[PDB]
Design a protein around this ligand. Structure first.
Ligand SMILES: COc1ccc(S(=O)(=O)Nc2ccc(F)c(C(=O)O)c2)c2ccccc12
Length: 136
């Protein structure tokens, strides 16, 4: 197998900034104690590509998580804040677009490369958060 555009995401990343994540989590419905502990976390994100399968791992003092998926193919995800969601991730012009659906709600997480950073932008009912990762 040859190179893929999404190889731009592959590597080991560390959170360096987080904006408005508490308000995003409130909109998602995250309870007080989980919001406080999850908001403190400075996760590492490890992204790998093997054939058609993309794996995104997150490691932090709060939770360790791993999802593996094929673009366009829905999967079951248990999120770090313990939602059981249906997730679909697609590639739109270089941007990984991740929709989570649960309990009649939905949120969108976009992951994109900007300069040497990995930028994560998420939105829930008009509330956006931006989290920036750098190479570890
Ligand atoms: C460390 O507490 C979390 C880790 C992960 C998730 S999530 O369900 O994976 N969605 C998401 C949204 C924006 C982001 F920037 C990232 C990220 O930084 O990876 C992840 C969380 C969702 C709700 C509350 C806390 C979350």
């Amino acid at each position: 197998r040859g190179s893929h555009m999404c190889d731009a995401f592959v590597g080991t990343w560390k959170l360096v900034s987080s904006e408005n994540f508490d308000d995003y989590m409130k909109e998602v419905g995250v309870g007080f104690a989980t919001r406080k502990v999850a908001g403190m976390a400075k996760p590492n994100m490890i992204i790998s590509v093997n054939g058609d399968v993309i794996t995104i791992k997150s490691e932090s003092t709060f939770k360790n998580t791993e999802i593996s998926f094929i673009l366009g193919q829905e999967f079951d995800e248990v999120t770090a804040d313990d939602r059981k969601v249906k997730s679909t991730i697609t590639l739109d012009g270089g941007v990984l677009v991740h929709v989570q659906k649960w309990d009649g709600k939905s949120t969108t997480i976009k992951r994109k490369r900007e300069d040497d950073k990995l930028v994560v932008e998420c939105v829930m009912k008009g509330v956006t958060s931006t989290r920036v990762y750098e190479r570890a």
